[PDB]
Structures are given as structure tokens and as C-alpha cells.
Design a protein around this ligand. Sequence first.
Ligand SMILES: CC(=O)N[C@@H]1[C@@H](O)[C@@H](O)[C@@H](CO)O[C@H]1O
Ligand SMILES: CC(=O)N[C@@H]1[C@@H](O)[C@@H](O)[C@@H](CO)O[C@H]1O
Ligand SMILES: CC(=O)N[C@@H]1[C@@H](O)[C@@H](O)[C@@H](CO)O[C@H]1O
Ligand SMILES: [Ca+2]
Ligand SMILES: [Ca+2]
Ligand SMILES: [Ca+2]
Ligand SMILES: [Ca+2]
Ligand SMILES: [Ca+2]
Ligand SMILES: [Ca+2]
Ligand SMILES: [Ca+2]
Ligand SMILES: [Ca+2]
Ligand SMILES: [Ca+2]
Ligand SMILES: [Cl-]
Ligand SMILES: [Cl-]
Lengths: 154, 154, 154
Amino acid sequence: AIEVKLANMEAEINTLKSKLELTNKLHAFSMGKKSGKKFFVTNHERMPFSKVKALCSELRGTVAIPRNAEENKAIQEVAKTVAFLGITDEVTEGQFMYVTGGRLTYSNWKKDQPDDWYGHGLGGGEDCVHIVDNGLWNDISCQASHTAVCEFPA
Amino acid sequence: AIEVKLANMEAEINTLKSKLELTNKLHAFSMGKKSGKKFFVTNHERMPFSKVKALCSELRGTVAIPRNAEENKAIQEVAKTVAFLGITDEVTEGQFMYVTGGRLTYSNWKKDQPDDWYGHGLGGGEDCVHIVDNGLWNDISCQASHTAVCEFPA
Amino acid sequence: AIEVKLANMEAEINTLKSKLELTNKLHAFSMGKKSGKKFFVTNHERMPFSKVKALCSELRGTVAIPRNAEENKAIQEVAKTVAFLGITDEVTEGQFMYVTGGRLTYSNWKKDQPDDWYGHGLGGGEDCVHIVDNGLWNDISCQASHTAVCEFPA
Ligand SMILES: CC(=O)N[C@@H]1[C@@H](O)[C@@H](O)[C@@H](CO)O[C@H]1O
Ligand SMILES: CC(=O)N[C@@H]1[C@@H](O)[C@@H](O)[C@@H](CO)O[C@H]1O
Ligand SMILES: CC(=O)N[C@@H]1[C@@H](O)[C@@H](O)[C@@H](CO)O[C@H]1O
Ligand SMILES: [Ca+2]
Ligand SMILES: [Ca+2]
Ligand SMILES: [Ca+2]
Ligand SMILES: [Ca+2]
Ligand SMILES: [Ca+2]
Ligand SMILES: [Ca+2]
Ligand SMILES: [Ca+2]
Ligand SMILES: [Ca+2]
Ligand SMILES: [Ca+2]
Ligand SMILES: [Cl-]
Ligand SMILES: [Cl-]
């Protein structure tokens, strides 16, 4: 009966994997994931950039990144407040890179930005980026606290 | 002792099956499932009727079908926008059927509806049904795009 | 093969435990849970207090309890309507205790409340509590039906 039990166990585990996969698809759908599109999610909590990265990473996701107007819109609609984006120029001042690697292609900066401003007193300039209400971008200090928005694959 | 190891693993599996069921109930609850009532959910995506059916099927659910005043209002509030219902007369004009079978019973038509309007100059007349923000019903082209709402058993 | 197959299943089970934990974490995150803080969830259903208690228990949570003004507002924002709180004076009239045990360490009683009113005609005085307008408290009949709001640990 040992082999029969082992064979049933494999079947129990497989059925469980299948149901968990279904749970995951249903949750993404209920959270607004559009067919074939990447989806964004937030808990509406503000925190320094390093905390957003750590949080999304814990969720097996990454800090939200707009690759085009459509996604930029989706992120602002999900965030409903100023939120960090997975874009920074910490590695080399002036050159913005996606946290997941690579130079910035699409951009949607506000007029007169980025400006690596120091007048905020949080020490240093501005090497992180956040999306404001109207969808335009601004470089801000990575120490500032803004809404955490994580992104999950299409 | 393999038999002992196997028994303990079976216990672990049973615990995970209970935890996953708990996850499922908490999620249904968080998305508004009322006790002893069917559960309606949407990702707020508009799409032709053919896709709504496909998406809901992939999630092991069906296109939302209101069977009474209670459910009509519940679905209304979930969609929050004009959404398709699982009702069609595609087969035989004038004979609206439930995507899951049977002739239409409960209905909440808007004054002058159905009317199988062809004036939309798209394709045929109107063989699908959607709910307006007012909660009423209207037959519409099955190729128009409206919010996708799926339903799960009570 | 047997022992090799069994070892693999231990790995399959452990992998599933981690994936389900990740799923639970993302869901709490999507339901608004803030880092290191407890969170509240509701399906927006009104029901008698005993129903609320049994339901939250089934979800492995407890009936929502404000421990401070901060949490009191949180509950108020999630419920959006009048909701029951996990506080009652059923054991000893006049002394409200947390359904989880212990005397109140924080209260936000409305003026002229608690009054253990009998004029409601449901029978008995008022031994339960619900948060009303402005986030203020009022003792109400446990027989009355109000929004179910459950609490889960930080
Ligand atoms: C939220 C925002 O845009 N903040 C910017 C700040 O980063 C800096 O550029 C400053 C220049 O004086 O202007 C501010 O408006
Ligand atoms: C949303 C809605 O009701 N659309 C209807 C359309 O289906 C068709 O019946 C047309 C004929 O006049 O009238 C419109 O108002
Ligand atoms: C919803 C509410 O506050 N109900 C209270 C009721 O509990 C009782 O105290 C009554 C006495 O007159 O006053 C009402 O305002
Ligand atoms: Ca720099
Ligand atoms: Ca910079
Ligand atoms: Ca700036
Ligand atoms: Ca027809
Ligand atoms: Ca028709
Ligand atoms: Ca019509
Ligand atoms: Ca009493
Ligand atoms: Ca009392
Ligand atoms: Ca009272
Ligand atoms: Cl910085
Ligand atoms: Cl009572």
C-alpha cells in the first residue's frame, strides 16, 4: 500500500497546485489585472523608496514602472496619490535607470524636471522618481515617503 | 520509517488544503460575497461579450446572471458601470436564453426594451444584454464592449 | 525510487507552503494592510452580532476592535457604514469588555451613551457596540443587524 499512498499523494499535491494557480488568477482579476497586461497593486501606504523595493520584492514583484502612456495611466489610477516608480539615477547621476536594469526609454517628466534638487534638506539631491496626480514625473529624494505600488508580470 | 514519514506528510497536505480554503473564503469575503449568496466580481475591463465568456470560464465561473431584484442590485453595485449579463437571444431572435441554459425568467427591462436595434451599423441587431447604471436592462450588440463581471456559486 | 519520490514530495509540499504564504501576503497587501499593523476587512454585510462573531471566527480573525483613535478611524474608513465592534457588556451589565477579554483601554462614546436602552423593542437592553456617525460609539442591541468588520493581526 506504500506505492498507492505515494501515488495518491502526488495527485493530492498536483490538485493543490492547480487550485492555488486558480486562486492566484482569480485574485489578480479581482484586483484589476487586464487580460494580457501587467497589473499594479498598492496598499496605499507611504514609505521611503528602499522600503517599497523591499516590500514589492517580498511579494515577488517589483516597484511599478510605466513603459508607455497606457501603463503610466494605469499606475496613477491604481495609486490615486504620489507614488514611487522603479526608476532612479543613484548609480550614475543624471542617467535614470530602471531598478530592473537598463536606461530609461519612455519618460514623462514634468516641466523643469529632473533637477536633482538639494533644497529639501533630507541630505543629498534627488535620485528617485515619483508619479504625481496628473501623471507627470519628478525626481525626488529616495528618503522621502510616497505610496508603494508594486508591479506583477503580464 | 517511511510509513511514518508518509503519514506526517499526509497531515501536512491536509493542513495546506484547509489553509487554501481559508484563503479562498477570506478573499471572497474581502470582495463582497454575502453569506449564502452568489459571488460577483470584475476587473473593470470592457470587452465584447465573446471575451467576457472566455475570461469567466478560465476562472471557473460564469457570466453574471441576475435571478432577482437582490442579485440585480448586487451586480449593479459590483460593475459600477455598464456590464454584460449572461443572457442572449443570439440563437433565436426574441428568445433570450441564459448562457448556462434555460429561457429567461426574471427580467428588468428598460422601457421600450428589447427592441433588437440594427441602427448601430455594426453587426446584425442586438442579441446581448447589459445593465445600465440605473440597474435596468437593455439588449445590445454582442460586439459592443462592456465591463466583464463573473459569478461564482453561493 | 520510493525514498527518492518521498523526498521530492517533501520539497513539493514545502514549496507549496511558501507559495501559499506569498499569496496570503499579497492578498493582505491588496486589502490595504499597512506594514506591521493590524488590518480590517468587511464584505459590507449587515447582520446580528452573533453572526459577525461566527463569521470572523470562520475566517480566523476576530470582530474589529479599536485600540486607539488611529485604529478607530481605520475601522470607520473600511466599514463606510455603521458597524459592530468587538466590545460588549453581556457578561456584566455596565462594564464593556473586549470580546477577546479585558476592560476597555480606549473608548469613543457618543454623548449620552452607553444607555442600555430598552425602547428599541427587540427585547433586552443594549449590550453590543457599533461605531456610528463621526466615528463615535453607541451601545446597541446585539440583535440588531450592522456591518461585519473582521480584524487580522499585525
Ligand atoms: C513634488 C515635486 O514636484 N517636488 C519638486 C522638487 O523635487 C524640486 O524639483 C523643486 C524645485 O524647487 O520643485 C518641487 O516642485
Ligand atoms: C443603452 C441603450 O439603451 N441603448 C439603446 C440601443 O440599444 C437601441 O435600443 C437604441 C434604439 O433607439 O436606443 C438606445 O438607447
Ligand atoms: C443608532 C443610535 O444611536 N441609537 C440610540 C439607541 O441605542 C438608544 O440609545 C436611544 C435612546 O433614545 O438613542 C438612539 O440614538
Ligand atoms: Ca546622485
Ligand atoms: Ca539625481
Ligand atoms: Ca525634482
Ligand atoms: Ca438576432
Ligand atoms: Ca436580438
Ligand atoms: Ca436595445
Ligand atoms: Ca445586559
Ligand atoms: Ca448593556
Ligand atoms: Ca444606546
Ligand atoms: Cl536621493
Ligand atoms: Cl443586547
